[PDB]
């Protein structure tokens, strides 16, 4: 591992509640001069774009997922935890002519 964009290690939640995943790094990949994307990523399978450009959801994404980016860190909130949410979430910083600088990852458990 060598991801200069760290996340929130891991976190837990319960059904009906809301979580929050952090994503920050140095001034070289974050934040007010970069767009943050969020990917739900089951273990080594088919990922899914959730939010692009800090707080813009992908087509058909549930209104539960929300994004916020302060001047030093970006957050992904998962309002109203539904059972099909146990997976790993990765963030990525980018501009209009760059690549995805992915994050470390954050496993989110919904056991309740």
């Amino acid at each position: 591992s060598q991801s200069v964009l760290t996340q929130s290690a891991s976190v837990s939640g319960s059904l009906g509640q809301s979580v929050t995943i952090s994503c920050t790094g140095p001034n070289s990949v974050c934040c007010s001069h970069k767009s943050i994307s969020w990917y739900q990523w089951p273990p080594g399978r088919a990922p899914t774009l959730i939010i692009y450009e800090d707080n813009e959801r992908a087509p058909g994404i549930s209104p539960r997922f929300s994004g916020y980016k302060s001047y030093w860190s970006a957050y992904l909130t998962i309002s109203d935890l539904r059972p099909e949410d146990e997976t790993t979430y990765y963030c990525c910083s980018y501009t209009h002519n760059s690549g995805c600088v992915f994050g470390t990852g954050t496993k989110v458990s919904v056991l309740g």
Binding site: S35, A46, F102
Partner: protein, 128 residues
Amino acid sequence: QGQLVQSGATTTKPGSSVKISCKTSGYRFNFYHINWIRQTAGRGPEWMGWISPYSGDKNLAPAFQDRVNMTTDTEVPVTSFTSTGAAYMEIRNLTSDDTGTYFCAKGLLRDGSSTWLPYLWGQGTLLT
């Protein structure tokens, strides 16, 4: 809004090279970039690079610039807004560190600030 089927799970040995296919359908293949992403057993996800099936333009991370052979065909138009394209992926100096699952990713939009963003992904291919 279409599929991006890939090749099988081919496992060779270090020093060699591997070719991975990415066959598209259900969308105008020229209208969106083709990103290449991998998740290896040793790190996490790592963005490799994208290529424009329209501009023929390549942009790839410096960690994979001198290893990756990245090409595309030309779309066989099905309808006014459907076609069938193909993107190809090869690597040079191969090791056991590069063992992981690989997928192609069609871009998100055709303009703006998130034009190339890996939106529509493939299925995954297991390397060495």
